């Protein structure tokens, strides 16, 4: 298993920005309000619009989640000197468009910007997490901290901005897209442990929790008003996480087919490859008609299971004679959570450089 063709992985598009023309409004406040020139602040407005260009126009690179974490960063700097959230005095209408429908979405509110640009980080990550082969060392390791920072972004939208602001930003949604990134990550995570050789239960316990992030996914898919906007990308989405949903619980259960022939019980070795090599038919079913890459990793899983499996049931047929306990009588494999939604410093110095409005 060392060995298995990498499963493929969802990533999410970016949001596509309108505008948020913020330099009239900070002018118009720091000379009201202050006792400024307007034109004494050009520069580090005019910064903060080609950081802005920047950001709603980012290289889909590693690079480019700096330039969004900066931006974010700076927009943070500008709110807590001119006030221009929800109702404020310097507010300005910032739109963007909602992703599913392609509805431009307005909001006279600075954290609506904040919002987007954090969701698009999200998005980012997950696209760089996805296109990765993980087949190398530097592969899995990356493409596991990316899920989790995809989660992480996902997971400080929900908190920190309750208030939708739009459908694709509900806390339902949000909360779809963290537990499929933690799957993801935790996926990553059992293959690097399965390539490690670690221990049968403890890979088992990994699988099983792969299993349970992709469960409530899947949950969150078969919701009608999250299906209806989502749309096709429902479609796709839970075809290949429900197909994931048995494998690992394939995967999970020859693993603790393996452990108990490491402890001599070979009657519920038999069990356990042979409740694996059911799970793995039911994935094989709900896998036609998806890519080969998927295919590959199925057919992979099955020549290691169905060759234990026979090998087990035989030597126990003939030489250790062992009833094959039903499955309900044996332990449950209760997941190993090993990832989590890495937390965002939205204003870490590191991250965010000089306040660009630091005279202010």
Same mark, same amino acid.
């Given at each position: 298993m060392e060995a298995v063709p990498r499963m493929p992985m969802i990533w999410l598009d970016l949001k596509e920005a309108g505008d948020f023309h913020?330099?009239?409004?900070?002018?118009?406040?720091? !000379?009201?309000?202050? +006792?400024?020139?307007? /034109?004494?602040?050009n520069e580090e407005l005019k910064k903060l619009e080609l950081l802005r260009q920047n950001a709603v126009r980012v290289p889909r690179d590693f690079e480019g989640c700096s330039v969004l974490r900066k931006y974010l960063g700076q927009l943070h700097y500008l709110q807590s000197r001119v006030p221009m959230g929800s109702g404020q005095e310097a507010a300005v209408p910032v739109t963007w468009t909602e992703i599913f429908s392609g509805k431009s979405v307005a909001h006279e509110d600075i954290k609506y910007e904040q919002a987007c640009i954090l969701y698009n980080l999200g998005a980012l990550h997950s696209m760089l997490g996805a296109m990765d082969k993980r087949v190398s060392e530097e592969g899995m390791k990356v493409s596991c901290t990316?899920?989790?920072?995809?989660? +992480?972004?996902?997971? #400080?939208?929900?908190?920190?901005?309750?208030?939708?602001?739009?459908?694709? $930003?509900?806390?339902?949604? &949000?909360?779809?897209?963290?537990?499929? $990134?933690?799957?993801?990550?935790?996926?990553?995570?059992?293959?690097?442990? $399965?390539?490690?050789?670690?221990?049968?239960?403890? %890979?088992?316990?990994?699988?099983?929790?792969? %299993?349970?992030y992709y469960k409530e996914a899947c949950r969150a898919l078969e919701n009608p008003d999250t299906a209806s906007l989502l749309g096709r990308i429902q479609k796709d989405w839970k075809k290949l996480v429900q197909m994931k949903i048995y494998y690992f619980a394939a995967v999970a259960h020859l693993h603790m087919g393996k452990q108990a022939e490491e402890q001599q019980k070979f009657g /519920?070795?038999?069990?356990?490859?042979?409740?694996? &090599?059911?799970?793995?038919? /039911?994935?094989?079913?709900?896998?036609?008609?998806?890519? *080969? =890459?998927?295919?590959?990793?199925?057919?992979? =899983?099955?020549?290691?299971? +169905?060759?234990? #499996?026979?090998?087990?049931?035989?030597?126990?047929?003939?030489?250790?004679? /062992?009833?094959?306990?039903?499955?309900?009588?044996?332990?449950?494999?209760?997941?190993?959570?090993?990832?989590?939604? !890495?937390?965002?410093?939205? =204003? *870490?110095?590191?991250? =965010? +450089?000089?306040?660009?409005?630091?005279?202010?």
């Amino acid at each position: 298993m060392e060995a298995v063709p990498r499963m493929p992985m969802i990533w999410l598009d970016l949001k596509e920005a309108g505008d948020f023309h913020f330099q009239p409004a900070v002018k118009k406040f720091v !000379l009201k309000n202050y +006792g400024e020139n307007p /034109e004494a602040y050009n520069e580090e407005l005019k910064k903060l619009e080609l950081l802005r260009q920047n950001a709603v126009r980012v290289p889909r690179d590693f690079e480019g989640c700096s330039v969004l974490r900066k931006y974010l960063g700076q927009l943070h700097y500008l709110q807590s000197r001119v006030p221009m959230g929800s109702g404020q005095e310097a507010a300005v209408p910032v739109t963007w468009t909602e992703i599913f429908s392609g509805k431009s979405v307005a909001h006279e509110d600075i954290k609506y910007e904040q919002a987007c640009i954090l969701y698009n980080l999200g998005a980012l990550h997950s696209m760089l997490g996805a296109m990765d082969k993980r087949v190398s060392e530097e592969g899995m390791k990356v493409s596991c901290t990316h899920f989790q920072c995809a989660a +992480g972004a996902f997971a #400080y939208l929900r908190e920190h901005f309750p208030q939708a602001y739009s459908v694709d $930003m509900s806390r339902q949604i &949000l909360t779809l897209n963290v537990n499929l $990134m933690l799957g993801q990550a935790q996926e990553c995570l059992l293959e690097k442990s $399965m390539l490690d050789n670690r221990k049968s239960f403890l %890979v088992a316990r990994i699988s099983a929790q792969v %299993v349970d992030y992709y469960k409530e996914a899947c949950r969150a898919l078969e919701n009608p008003d999250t299906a209806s906007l989502l749309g096709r990308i429902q479609k796709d989405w839970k075809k290949l996480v429900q197909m994931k949903i048995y494998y690992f619980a394939a995967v999970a259960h020859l693993h603790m087919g393996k452990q108990a022939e490491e402890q001599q019980k070979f009657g /519920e070795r038999v069990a356990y490859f042979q409740s694996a &090599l059911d799970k793995l038919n /039911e994935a094989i079913k709900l896998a036609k008609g998806q890519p *080969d =890459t998927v295919q590959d990793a199925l057919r992979f =899983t099955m020549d290691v299971i +169905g060759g234990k #499996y026979n090998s087990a049931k035989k030597d126990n047929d003939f030489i250790y004679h /062992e009833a094959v306990p039903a499955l309900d009588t044996l332990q449950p494999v209760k997941g190993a959570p090993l990832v989590k939604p !890495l937390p965002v410093n939205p =204003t *870490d110095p590191a991250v =965010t +450089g000089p306040d660009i409005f630091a005279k202010l």
